[PDB]
Design a binder for this molecule. Structure first.
Ligand SMILES: O=C(NCc1ccc(Oc2ccccc2)cc1)c1cnc(-n2cccn2)nc1O
Ligand SMILES: [Mn+2]
Length: 210
């Protein structure tokens, strides 16, 4: 359960490696339901965020609050993510997590598109923990690719994360974990939520106002 999973794995694993994976997070029924909602978003051309603003990502994204009609199971996923982070309260490094972003739903077309190497939060914008959920049924990375490769600072080796179905991924959002998405040869879906550190976000606000 959430508390046991948080205190006995996520907290120790995050403090040791900064990268954490939870498999079969929600179960098959809920996983396929989340997939159905995401596919509905894709089929009705909802991945149009940024499409009206001038400058280059190759994927398509949309932001989900979780309470929109047809997005309820995504909201349920977001609730479960929150339960875990809440049960970690105060024990995740030195962070005091007080908020989060909406869910970013990302679609990778499958024509070799991936995501260039980057750092999620390199300039202290307040994001401390990156949470990704994968909903790709029967993903065989040997053929379909789409592996997320993370290069943790203070490790010799890199960490390869297959976007397997019903998999949850946690990692520090700062310079410790640069990462890239390898080319995708099948439609690849991911849902990402970012949690905020209170004081770092306050410092960021002060910088914006100063
Ligand atoms: O950083 C990102 N996008 C910009 C962003 C994200 C969240 C934000 O929320 C807030 C809101 C308010 C204050 C601070 C942050 C803001 C900007 C971002 C990071 N990785 C990826 N990957 C794609 C594949 C693997 N990784 N794609 C991304 O688009
Ligand atoms: Mn990223």
């Amino acid at each position: 359960p959430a508390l046991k999973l948080a205190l006995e794995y996520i907290v120790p694993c995050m403090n040791k490696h900064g990268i954490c994976v939870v498999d079969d997070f929600l179960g098959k029924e809920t996983g396929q339901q989340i997939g159905d909602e995401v596919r509905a978003l894709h089929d009705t051309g909802k991945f149009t965020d940024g499409q009206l603003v001038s400058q280059i990502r190759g994927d398509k994204i949309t932001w989900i609050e979780g309470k929109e009609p047809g997005c309820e199971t995504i909201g349920l996923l977001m609730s479960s993510m929150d339960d875990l982070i809440r049960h970690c309260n105060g024990k995740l490094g030195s962070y005091k997590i007080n908020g989060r972003t909406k869910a970013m739903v990302a679609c990778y077309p499958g024509n070799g598109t991936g995501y260039v190497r980057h750092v999620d939060n390199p300039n202290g914008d307040g994001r401390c923990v990156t949470c990704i959920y994968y909903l790709n049924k029967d993903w065989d990375a040997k053929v379909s690719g789409g592996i997320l490769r993370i290069f943790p600072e203070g490790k010799a080796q890199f960490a390869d994360i297959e976007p397997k179905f019903d998999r949850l991924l946690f990692f520090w959002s700062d310079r410790r974990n640069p990462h890239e998405v390898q080319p995708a040869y099948a439609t690849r879906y991911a849902i990402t939520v970012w949690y905020f550190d209170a004081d770092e976000r306050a410092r960021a606000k002060v910088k914006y106002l100063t």
